[PDB]
Design a protein around this nucleic acid. Structure first.
Length: 10
DNA sequence: GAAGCTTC
DNA sequence: GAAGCTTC
């Protein structure tokens, strides 16, 4: 997730 | 080490 | 199997 905590996604 | 799910 | 990097 994020970043941080990508997306999700990407 | 945990923290981090939603896509292609 | 690849695709997403940054936080705590």
């Amino acid at each position: 997730t994020x970043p941080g905590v990508t997306x999700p996604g990407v």
